[PDB]
């Protein structure tokens, strides 16, 4: 199927409590595979998935050098943005970066990504052309004009179309037994009386990978979007995910309700009912 690689960087200032912390994590699809934390006793890039362990010392050392340099760069960035927004040195602020590459089912590049945010709001993004920028405000325009002068977009394009895809394809092969295995949800419906005339129907999906899933309720074949409580998809801790959707129904009308499940791991969408 389709696959992606992403790095997620968080840099957070903390006046009075030392220099800004830098954390980086890397994912292939919904599987984390590395981490780096500048607050670690001995900061170094660490494996977080079994299939990355086979990478040699040069891989780990080169990663660590990159992240240690980044730690310093983001400290410069935090200082710069503080100034661009005329902010006090007293406050704590966060820069985040997200970047990586998406492949289609045939392993070809679909598109690249490279976005940044300040205090949780979009700041600057590389456009899909991998050539031009979108700046959120006049502060980010300062960054834009700078990055334009230094031809940053060209460097990011070269990475996203080159190393990004090459390393992703490699990880996909080395981790093929898990990364290219979809685990379908285990599904069931539970029934919980609320009162004499109403009951909750809850449609469960458990043990699935990847996280993407569609879980809905219909009444007489019509979607119940407004009346469905749908919890965020949540990690089980064993690589898999969980989700449920619930409706409150009139007692006796349970068989008018059907829960519909779509997941890449399923040949065809599933239809479930409460089974007393």
């Amino acid at each position: 199927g389709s696959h992606s690689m992403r790095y997620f960087y968080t840099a957070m200032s903390r006046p009075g409590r030392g220099e800004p912390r830098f954390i980086a994590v890397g994912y292939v699809d919904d599987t984390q595979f590395v981490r780096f934390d500048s607050d670690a006793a001995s900061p170094r890039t660490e494996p977080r998935a079994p299939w990355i362990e086979q990478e040699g010392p040069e891989y780990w050392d080169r990663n660590t050098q990159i992240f240690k340099t980044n730690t310093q760069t983001y400290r410069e960035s935090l200082r710069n943005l503080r100034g661009y927004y005329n902010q006090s040195e007293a406050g704590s602020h966060i820069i985040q970066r997200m970047y990586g590459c998406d492949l289609g089912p045939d392993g070809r590049l679909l598109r690249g990504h490279d976005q940044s945010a300040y205090d949780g709001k979009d700041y600057i993004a590389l456009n899909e052309d991998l050539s031009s920028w979108t700046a959120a405000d006049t502060a980010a325009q300062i960054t834009q004009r700078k990055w334009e002068a230094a031809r940053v977009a060209e460097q990011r394009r070269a990475y996203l179309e080159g190393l990004c895809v090459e390393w992703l394809r490699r990880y996909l092969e080395n981790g093929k037994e898990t990364l290219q295995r979809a685990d379908p949800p285990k599904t069931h419906v539970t029934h919980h009386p609320v009162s004499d005339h109403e009951a909750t129907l809850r449609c469960w999906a458990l043990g699935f990978y990847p996280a993407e899933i569609t879980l809905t309720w219909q009444r007489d074949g019509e979607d119940q979007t407004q009346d469905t409580e749908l919890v965020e998809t949540r990690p089980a801790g064993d690589r898999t995910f969980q989700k449920w959707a619930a409706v409150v129904v009139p007692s006796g009308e349970e068989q008018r309700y059907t829960c519909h499940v779509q997941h890449e791991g399923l040949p065809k969408p599933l239809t479930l009912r409460w089974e007393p």
Binding site: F8, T10, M12, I23, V25, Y27, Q32, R35, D37, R48, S92, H93, I94, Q96, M98, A117, D119, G120, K121, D122, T190, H192, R202, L206, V231, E232, R234, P235, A236, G237, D238, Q242, W244
Partner: protein
């Protein structure tokens, strides 16, 4: 700046069966900034040696973390997650309900 309060779910890794070892999870998500305090509680008391995932975030830039520890559910033992964040004026306690 604008801040976002955490969503909180408390649940087990495997279906709860009284008397058998499992994992108790507290998933916090949708929050900003990233500093957050999470405790897992057994009968109101803080469980020691709780682990958590590495800080990451969603497409909307909000953060998520999974806190987890081994536990053996019983009929009477009560489990919960206690969360504090800059958006909260007092820790929020969410009780573990095996049906959720």
């Amino acid at each position: 700046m604008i801040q976002r309060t955490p969503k909180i779910q408390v649940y087990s890794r495997h279906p709860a069966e009284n008397g058998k070892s499992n994992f108790l999870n507290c998933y916090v998500s949708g929050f900003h900034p990233s500093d957050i305090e999470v405790d897992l509680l057994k009968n109101g008391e803080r469980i020691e040696k709780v682990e958590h995932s590495d800080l990451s975030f969603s497409k909307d830039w909000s953060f998520y973390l999974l806190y987890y520890t081994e536990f053996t559910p019983t009929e009477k033992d009560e489990y919960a997650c206690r969360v504090n964040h800059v958006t909260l004026s007092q820790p929020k306690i969410v009780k573990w309900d095996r049906d959720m």
